[PDB]
Ligand binder design. Structure first.
Ligand SMILES: [Mg+2]
Length: 756
DNA sequence: ATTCGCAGTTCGCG
DNA sequence: CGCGAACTGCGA
């Protein structure tokens, strides 16, 4: 199968390299015949002779147009003629494309910012990660000597650990009495030993945790300091470092550097993304943290080095375990989008859709629109109305059914053919008209995006049912991941429509989807109220909670099923209302905030403090305890005692500090903040010292007993010391626990002073 | 560098 | 003092 592609230059000419793994054998294929190109729209065909002679210069070398040819393509449905301009080397394109655009007779240029290697995959119809080839993977991690006021990588690497199917080992240059530790003489020897391991194991995938922004950078500075050729690549090359906006990314030629950090960041939602928290949430098993201070202290005193080595070992071990858990899913996502695992695992929603569309556009001879320039970008800051949210009838309800649409937004796009190439298209014999916004969509032919979206949803269903019949457990897992990958991509189309940087951006399409959605959800609600006598307790966008307050559980279920039969006969196209679940009880606090419990006793919570990371565990824990007492036991006076118990424990300082940590994300550069909240205050004190802060950093702090604002009393939890610090019991009672619980017990008539 | 709608806290202004 | 901007993270 295909892992990746790139190009090298030989005698001034680009040579594509295709990196493959066939039958457990690494292979490189070379292609010297692929020509870089982009398109130009001319107002006059005669102008082509002027464009041929346009020249530029890269670095002394003179850039010219190799050859041209007129081609006929489609642009948003309508037919168009443009000139395909070829060049000798892909680096000629960025050097001359501006000179060609600025030419008077050139209306516009297209597809001029597509990387050569990616252009090759699309044009040749090649799909990475296709097949059942098993990749050999290796995880690794490092431990370092940290001192507070030093430069990056001023301290040596203390240990390098790695892990695969054979287990986990640690390389270090001090004597450690553990069976999985290999001892060498120096840091230099340790690094060289690691090179040999990678060379001999020859893994297809190198797995790290935050290796893009720490590990490889640290190794690089150290190899420079020690004079080592850090040749990790299968071609003898050193890791290549690239700039991805305000962050970094690292390739290793011939293999795939799989950094788990950006992947897990997108896949699951956690309060913090430390390696310990991630592992404990995914595998449900604890992992002890050993801090930089303890590591430094252990290395200098020579004392607890076993503890450090074990931590180093577990880092590599869990990294390998997590890599095994997340990689196959990302691999199937890569195959779907049609780009390398390296790019896909580091790409967000916007880029993934765009690359998929770019490939499909080529297959359909569809000329792709350009990225918006700064002027057009500012013109796309106009917003639109979103989903409908009913104000809930607040309180505790009995025997509730939840009904919702199966894929509401994708169903709308397919059913009503919503697409920029069908928008207000004149000359058609059939149209659908969006409510409120009034946009018309041609129904005569499948639109580009609804066509692709329809194939995706259809393919997904064919995979779901083939899974049930697939005996081979490995094939079933593969199909499961592809099916999940399709769901992710299919649900990304709507948001992409309203994404201002998108090539196929269309605000009219985006607001038409939401307008139609508001219509269908509101029609369905008044339908079940008027014709079946249900009370609709609450509704958000694509579903609602309903019940008959004076009815039996089986009575509610029966009537709900009858309603479903009724409205589904009225719904057009692919729209379908479904029976999502029945709930014994439910408590609806506000819009976006509620909790329900099924007949098994399982509680599901939305929006409440319990779900959020910017609330201490102590507040979330008793809110969950209160909610359980109400939903499962129906015991309101028990919920009260629990709060009295918790506030008393807090006031007497019997609560562990670990359950008092508050987590809050830094979203921008610290200088760009206008209002300084507690987490920003803590961040600025950190940045004042050694530690640098990036947008995406989660600040974990605790509030201390003292004077001043909350931000003046807040410190990072790592630095909390019982001998130096005392947490603010009053704060965690009056600002954390009580507000979170009072908002629930308010409905029963309890004040804050009813619980102290 | 996917969308909009919404509850809630901290802090500073008048 | 009330009040609103700034800010975060959630639901769909
Ligand atoms: Mg709103």
């Amino acid at each position: 199968m295909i892992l990746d592609t790139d190009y090298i230059t030989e005698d001034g000419k680009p040579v594509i390299r295709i990196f493959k793994k066939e039958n457990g054998e690494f292979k490189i294929e070379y292609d010297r015949t692929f020509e870089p190109y982009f398109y130009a729209l001319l107002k006059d065909d005669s102008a082509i002779e002027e464009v041929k002679k346009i020249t530029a210069e890269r670095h002394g070398t003179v850039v010219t147009v190799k050859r041209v040819e007129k081609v006929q393509k489609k642009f948003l449905g309508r037919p168009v003629e443009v000139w395909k301009l070829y060049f000798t080397h892909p680096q000629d394109v960025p050097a001359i494309r501006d000179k060609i655009r600025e030419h008077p007779a050139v209306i516009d240029i297209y597809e001029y910012d597509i990387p050569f290697a990616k252009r090759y995959l699309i044009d040749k119809g090649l799909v990475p990660m296709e097949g059942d080839e098993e990749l050999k993977m290796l995880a690794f991690a490092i431990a370092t000597l940290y001192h507070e006021g030093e430069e990056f990588a001023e301290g040596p690497i203390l240990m390098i650990s790695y892990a695969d199917e054979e287990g986990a080992r640690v390389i270090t240059w001090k004597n450690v009495d553990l069976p999985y530790v290999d001892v060498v003489s120096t840091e230099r020897e340790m690094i060289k030993r690691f090179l040999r391991v990678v060379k001999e194991k020859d893994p297809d995938v190198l797995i790290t945790y935050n290796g893009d922004n720490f590990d490889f950078a640290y190794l690089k500075k150290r190899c420079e300091k020690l004079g080592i050729n850090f040749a990790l690549g299968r071609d003898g090359s050193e890791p290549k470092i690239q700039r991805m906006g305000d962050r970094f990314a690292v390739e290793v030629k011939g293999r795939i550097h799989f950094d788990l950090y950006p992947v897990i960041r997108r896949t699951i939602n956690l309060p913090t993304y430390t390696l310990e928290a991630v592992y404990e949430a995914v595998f449900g098993q604890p992992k002890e943290k050993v801090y930089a201070e303890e590591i430094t202290t252990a290395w200098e005193t020579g004392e607890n080095l076993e503890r450090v080595a074990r931590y180093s070992m577990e880092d590599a071990k869990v990294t390998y375990e997590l890599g095994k858990e997340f990689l196959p899913m990302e691999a199937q996502l890569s195959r779907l989008i049609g780009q390398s695992l390296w790019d896909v695992s580091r790409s967000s929603t916007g880029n993934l859709v765009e690359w998929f569309l770019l490939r499909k556009a080529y297959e359909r001879n569809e000329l792709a629109p350009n990225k918006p320039d700064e002027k057009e970008l500012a013109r796309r800051r106009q917003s639109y109305e979103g989903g409908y949210v009913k104000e809930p009838e607040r309180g505790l309800w009995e025997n509730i059914v939840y009904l919702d649409f199966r894929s509401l937004y994708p169903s709308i796009i397919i059913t009503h053919n919503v697409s920029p190439d069908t928008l207000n298209r004149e000359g058609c014999k059939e149209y659908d008209v969006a409510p409120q916004v009034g946009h018309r969509f041609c129904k005569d032919f499948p639109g580009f995006i609804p066509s692709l979206l329809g194939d995706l949803l259809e393919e997904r269903q064919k995979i779901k049912k083939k899974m049930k019949a697939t005996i081979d457990p490995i094939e079933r897992k593969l199909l499961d991941y592809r099916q999940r990958a399709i769901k992710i991509l299919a649900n990304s189309y709507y948001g992409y429509y309203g994404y201002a940087r998108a090539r196929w951006y269309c605000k009219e399409c985006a607001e038409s989807v939401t307008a139609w959605g508001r219509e269908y959800i509101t029609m369905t609600i008044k339908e079940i109220e008027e014709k079946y006598g249900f009370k609709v307790i609450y509704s958000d966008t694509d579903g609602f909670f309903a019940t008959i307050p004076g009815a039996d559980a089986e009575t509610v279920k029966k009537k709900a099923m009858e309603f479903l039969k009724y409205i589904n006969a009225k719904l057009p196209g692919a729209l379908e209302l479904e029976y999502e679940g029945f709930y014994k009880r439910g408590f609806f606090v506000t819009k976006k905030k509620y909790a329900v419990i099924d007949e098994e006793g399982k509680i599901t919570t939305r929006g409440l403090e319990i779900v959020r990371r910017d609330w201490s565990e102590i507040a979330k824990e008793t809110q969950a305890r209160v909610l359980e007492a109400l939903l499962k036991d129906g015991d309101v006076e028990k919920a009260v005692r629990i709060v009295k118990e918790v506030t008393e424990k807090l006031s007497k300082y019997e609560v562990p500090p670990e359950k008092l940590v508050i987590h809050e994300q830094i979203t921008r550069d610290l200088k760009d903040y206008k209002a300084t909240g507690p987490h920003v205050a803590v961040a600025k004190r950190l940045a004042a010292r050694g530690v640098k802060i990036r947008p995406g950093t989660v600040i974990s702090y605790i509030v201390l007993k003292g004077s001043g604002r909350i931000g003046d009393r807040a410190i990072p939890f790592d630095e909390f010391d019982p001998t130096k610090h005392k947490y603010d019991a009053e704060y965690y009672i009056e600002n954390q626990v009580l507000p979170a619980v009072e908002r629930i017990l308010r409905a029963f008539g309890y004040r804050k002073e009813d619980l102290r």
